[PDB]
């Protein structure tokens, strides 16, 4: 483009609505607010969740439960994200990270079995599910809980 012939992508820009600027716009005198009341006043909205005095919803339902501050949570790796490795490889937490399969390892890796393996590997992680460990030791190769 030249600097005197700029055009934006079609559909990307749009002009803002200006209210209270005459009758023909459609938003003139009362500016879209209707007639008198609490909602037509400056700074006049009522609080979100307020129901006019009827008991609000989040005070007639009971509280429930607690939160455990020592909760653990694992980085999940399913069984079909291991098909981008070659046979014989030693899949280790240091390798899943650099390979971009795990961004953040929270409490350690945990292997789950959701796809199909179709590879022969030796995997070493923190936790396995029954199906995952079973499916790894079906094409050969083993697993080692570290």
């Amino acid at each position: 483009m030249k600097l005197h012939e700029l055009k934006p992508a079609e559909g990307s820009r749009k002009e803002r609505n200006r209210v209270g600027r005459g009758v023909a716009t459609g938003n003139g005198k009362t500016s879209g607010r209707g007639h008198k009341g609490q909602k037509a006043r400056s700074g006049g909205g009522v609080r979100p969740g307020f129901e006019g005095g009827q008991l609000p919803l989040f005070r007639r339902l009971p509280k429930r439960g607690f939160t455990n501050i020592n909760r653990k949570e694992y980085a999940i790796v399913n069984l079909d994200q291991l098909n981008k490795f070659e046979d014989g490889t030693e899949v280790t937490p240091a390798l899943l990270v650099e390979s971009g399969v795990v961004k953040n390892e929270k409490s350690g890796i945990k292997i789950l079995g959701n796809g199909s393996l179709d590879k022969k590997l030796t995997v070493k992680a923190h936790k396995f599910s029954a199906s995952a460990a079973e499916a790894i030791d079906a094409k050969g190769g083993a697993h080692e809980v570290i």
Binding site: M1, K2, K7, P8, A9, S12
Partner: protein, 206 residues
């Protein structure tokens, strides 16, 4: 991807191979528009202000009684409808800059450079050799290899004598391979880049 390498006189030297990943893509105009809009919005210092009700001098007391005088009810001599003062919603000091993902910044540079190379706006030269700054000498160089009036000169690293010789010519701008921006490239009619600078551009952007 072949480009002639001229000398400071219009005679030809060897050719050169510039990558088609940098020079030679299909220029994206949406990203160019957004990049130009971004760069130019980041140049303004929004230093402007007005005084509202609170900041105008004086105006503490009530002008007259609420009832009984036959006049309109007023609260202060600095309300907005008074000639005294008090602005309602004017300008306030703020910044206008914003940001784009960096994959888009590189795409904008690549599409601005390739547009010059498809309009025959790119000229590669072997070397600039200026021992002392002399504008009359640079003018003749620019006229020998016929250039338009708006030219952007690009060197590999900062060259004190070349940059100091093209400084007072109207329409000429000098920069470095790493100081390339979308506003300078699209404002120019032609690029005059050296061989080393072209190789350096070909890698950082590739």
């Amino acid at each position: 991807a072949n480009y002639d390498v001229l000398k400071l006189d219009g005679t030809k030297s060897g050719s050169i191979e510039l990558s088609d990943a940098v020079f030679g893509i299909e220029p994206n105009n949406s990203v160019l528009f957004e990049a130009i809009n971004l760069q130019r919005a980041s140049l303004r210092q929004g230093t402007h202000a007005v005084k509202n009700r609170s900041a105008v001098s004086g105006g503490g007391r009530k002008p007259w009684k609420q009832k009984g005088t036959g006049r309109a009810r007023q609260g202060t001599i600095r309300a907005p409808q008074w000639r005294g003062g008090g602005i309602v919603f004017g300008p306030t000091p703020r910044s206008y800059a914003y940001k784009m993902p960096k994959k888009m910044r590189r795409l904008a540079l690549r599409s601005a450079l390739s547009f010059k190379a498809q309009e025959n706006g790119l000229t590669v030269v072997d070397a600039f050799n200026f021992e002392a700054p002399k504008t009359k000498e640079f003018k003749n160089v620019l006229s020998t290899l016929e250039q338009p009036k708006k030219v952007l000169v690009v060197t590999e690293n900062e060259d004190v004598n070349v940059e100091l010789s093209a400084r007072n010519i109207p329409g000429v701008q000098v920069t470095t391979a790493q100081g390339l921006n979308v506003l300078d490239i699209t404002n120019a009619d032609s690029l005059v880049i050296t061989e080393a600078a072209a190789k350096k551009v070909e890698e950082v952007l590739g």
